[PDB]
Design a protein around this ligand. Structure first.
Ligand SMILES: CCCCCCCC/C=C\CCCCCCCC(=O)OC[C@H](O)CO
Ligand SMILES: CCCCCCCC/C=C\CCCCCCCC(=O)OC[C@H](O)CO
Ligand SMILES: CCCCCCCC/C=C\CCCCCCCC(=O)OC[C@H](O)CO
Ligand SMILES: CCCCCCCC/C=C\CCCCCCCC(=O)OC[C@H](O)CO
Ligand SMILES: CCCCCCCC/C=C\CCCCCCCC(=O)OC[C@H](O)CO
Ligand SMILES: CCCCCCCC/C=C\CCCCCCCC(=O)OC[C@H](O)CO
Ligand SMILES: CCCCCCCC/C=C\CCCCCCCC(=O)OC[C@H](O)CO
Ligand SMILES: CCCCCCCC/C=C\CCCCCCCC(=O)OC[C@H](O)CO
Ligand SMILES: CCCCCCCC/C=C\CCCCCCCC(=O)OC[C@H](O)CO
Ligand SMILES: CCCCCCCC/C=C\CCCCCCCC(=O)OC[C@H](O)CO
Ligand SMILES: CCCCCCCC/C=C\CCCCCCCC(=O)OC[C@H](O)CO
Ligand SMILES: CCCCCCCC/C=C\CCCCCCCC(=O)OC[C@H](O)CO
Ligand SMILES: CCCCCCCC/C=C\CCCCCCCC(=O)OC[C@H](O)CO
Ligand SMILES: CCCCCCCC/C=C\CCCCCCCC(=O)OC[C@H](O)CO
Ligand SMILES: CCCCCCCC/C=C\CCCCCCCC(=O)OC[C@H](O)CO
Ligand SMILES: CCCCCCCC/C=C\CCCCCCCC(=O)OC[C@H](O)CO
Ligand SMILES: [Cl-]
Ligand SMILES: [Cl-]
Length: 388
């Protein structure tokens, strides 16, 4: 593949419907003041995903399998349940985003939107490796081109450069800002990948480590520029204008209207649907690998797909706002990150696991600082959600 090739394919996988929810709402409600969050969360994701990838290369096993073989039964069971909750919140945002996109495209109610998504995800579940390549290449194009749109639009929108520069200085402005900051971190780090991304020769093992290190930083850098662009465009579009339903995904197409014209609405919803269909399908398979890795057995794949749809339909029948619950799921995912980092930081520092590929002492320290920072942000948010 060409030089930039790997950076493009891995970046579209990072574009969750939860990124749309957090970037649009972040810019429309708090201007440019959360740009440092997207930047910080992206750098932390570069460290974390590198440790996750180097653990699979050095040890030949994934994190659930290493926990199952090395830790006591009650701790394996605890981390299995915690990993299953991460899979629930991860698939909830993706499945609900696709159903919402169906509603934006056709006008059907959210219930039937989730039913359409359910048939598609059930049918996509049956298809083997043959057939996924034409569909995953098409959804990659929609999501990639909507990302290039925001990269171009961030220049044509003429954003307030003084406010853009100030937005890179870390500032939390109220309790609602921390809630959205936590959601941005949860949407960037993606703890479900931590448990799955891990899934011979020392000189050959170092080649894959150096090769993976370059590809993930090019992809995270591209995904980080697009996320900041989507937030900055949302800030320039809505912030300080008292627009009806500002930051909401039902009116988010207005961010690309001066560029795409009358096509902005369909092109946004199509990209939202493609971002949710591919993500909901790969995540429910990743949930199957995680249980088999933790427990040594797995439930039928159709049953897991059904259980993951139950929170989606319940949220719909409750009448809850889809854009609001997409942000909540990313907030919950951010609470699962510190639990995922503890086995990651410990295993990658052991020679009997990594061999000659033991992590540098400095990057282990940086990883623990990242874990302490996220615990601090989660506890700070949890304190203000219980009064105090
Ligand atoms: C923790 C409870 C998890 C329930 C499954 C049983 C288990 O994993 O062992 C725990 C046992 O109570 C040993 O303290
Ligand atoms: C806030 C931080 C935002 C981060 C934005 C990142 C990269 C800038 C855009 C990179 C892609 C460049 C496309 C823009 C462009 O070239 O459009 C210019 C237009 O032609 C003029 O007439
Ligand atoms: C990593 C990013 C580095 C952060 C620094 C600048 C933002 C980069 C984009 C430059 C935006 C213009 C900066 C600016 O205009 O600052 C105005 C001044 O600070 C008002 O008093
Ligand atoms: C914290 C311990 C580790 C620190 C490195 C990682 C910081 C990560 C995010 C910034 C949140 C902390 C804010 C302090 C960042 C330094 C700074 O420039 O402070 C900006 C502003 O003045 C502050 O009030
Ligand atoms: C940080 C490393 C990866 C980031 C690379 C960002 C480049 C985005 C691609 C095309 C820009 C669109 C150009 C459109 C020209 C008009
Ligand atoms: C290929 C040219 C466009 C093919 C159909 C795309 C239609 C489109 O982009 O716009 C949809 C909307 O109806 C516009 O108002
Ligand atoms: C009201 C809900 C009824 C059925 C839920 C969907 C169950 C039917 C679709 C699940 C897929 C399935 O049935 O599995 C078939 C087989 O295992 C693979 O070929
Ligand atoms: C709490 C939620 C739990 C819901 C409980 C199930 C609800 C029934 C739905 C579909 C059953 C029919 C679809 C599956 C039947 C064919 C699938 C199959 O392959 O056989 C099933 C069996 O597990 C060997 O694999
Ligand atoms: C371990 C706990 C994990 C997640 C708790 C979920 C967050 C606690 C409840 C969130 C409150 C909420 O639903 O909304 C918050 C509001 O939107 C903003 O101030
Ligand atoms: C949220 C809290 C996550 C746990 C964080 C630090 C404790 C890790 C235990 C220290 C290393 C044990 C070996
Ligand atoms: C939470 C504060 C940081 C906890 C550090 C725990 C730790 O560093 O464990 C030793 C390490 O595993 C040895 O390589
Ligand atoms: C939690 C109690 C304090 C943390 C226990 C010490 C952490 C630790 O050093 O254990 C990691 C590993 O065993 C080092 O090789
Ligand atoms: C304000 C920001 C606060 C965020 C906190 C700082 C996060 C960024 C720090 C370093 C990034 C460098 C990571 C680039 C890739 C490094 C490779 C790696 O992660 O691990 C390899 C290991 O060292 C093999 O032995
Ligand atoms: C507690 C709240 C405020 C604290 C804020 C600072 C966080 C604590 C400092 C470092 C964390 C532990 C990192 C240092 C231990 C790393 C383990 C290590 O590097 O050991 C060598 C490794 O085994 C090579 O093989
Ligand atoms: C270099 C090595 C040193 C590591 C950095 C030490 C940082 C903090 C020490 C612990 C601070 C204790 C307070 C816990 C954090 C908190 O809750 O903040 C509340 C706030 O301080 C009330 O105004
Ligand atoms: C993720 C799973 C759950 C882990 C987070 C929840 C609890 C963390 C313990 C406390 C961690 C540090 C939180 C203190 C935040 C702080 O520094 O200051 C807060 C204070 O209220 C300033 O007003
Ligand atoms: Cl261990
Ligand atoms: Cl401003």
């Amino acid at each position: 593949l060409p030089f930039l090739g790997p950076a493009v394919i891995a970046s579209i996988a990072y574009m969750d419907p939860g990124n749309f929810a957090t970037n649009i709402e972040g810019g429309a409600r708090y201007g440019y003041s959360l740009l440092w969050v997207i930047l910080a969360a992206n750098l932390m994701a570069m460290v974390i995903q590198n440790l996750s990838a180097n653990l699979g290369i050095a040890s030949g096993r994934n994190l659930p399998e290493l926990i199952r073989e090395r830790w006591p039964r009650p701790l394996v069971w605890f981390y299995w349940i915690q990993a299953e909750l991460v899979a629930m919140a991860t698939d909830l945002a993706e499945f609900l985003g696709a159903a919402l996109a169906i509603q934006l495209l056709t006008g059907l109610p959210m219930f039937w939107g989730a039913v359409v998504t359910g048939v598609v995800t059930f049918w996509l579940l049956n298809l083997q490796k043959r057939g996924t390549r034409p569909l995953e290449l098409a959804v990659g194009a929609f999501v990639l081109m909507i990302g290039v749109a925001y990269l171009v639009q961030v220049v044509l929108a003429r954003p307030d450069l003084a406010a853009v520069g100030a937005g890179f200085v870390p500032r939390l402005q109220g309790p609602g800002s921390a809630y959205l900051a936590v959601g941005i971190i949860g949407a960037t780090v993606m703890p479900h990948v931590i448990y799955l991304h891990s899934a011979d020769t020392t000189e050959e093992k170092r080649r894959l480590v150096r090769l993976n290190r370059v590809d993930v930083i090019a992809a995270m850098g591209l995904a980080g520029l697009i996320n900041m662009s989507m937030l900055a465009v949302a800030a320039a579009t809505f912030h300080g204008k008292n627009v009806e339903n500002a930051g909401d995904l039902t009116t988010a197409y207005q961010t690309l209207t001066p560029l795409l014209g009358p096509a902005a609405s369909v092109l946004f919803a199509v990209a939202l649907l493609a971002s949710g269909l591919s993500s909901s399908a790969v995540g429910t398979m990743a949930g199957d690998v995680i249980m088999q890795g933790f427990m040594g057995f797995h439930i039928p794949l159709w049953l897991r797909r059904l259980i993951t749809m139950l929170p989606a339909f319940i949220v719909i029948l409750l009448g809850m706002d889809p854009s609001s619950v997409l942000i909540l799921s990313q907030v919950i995912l951010c609470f699962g990150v510190p639990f995922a980092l503890v086995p990651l930081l410990l295993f990658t520092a052991r020679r009997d696991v990594m061999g000659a590929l033991v992590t540098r002492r400095s990057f282990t320290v940086i990883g623990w600082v990242i874990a302490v920072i996220i615990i601090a942000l989660n506890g700070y948010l949890l304190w203000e959600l219980l009064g105090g």
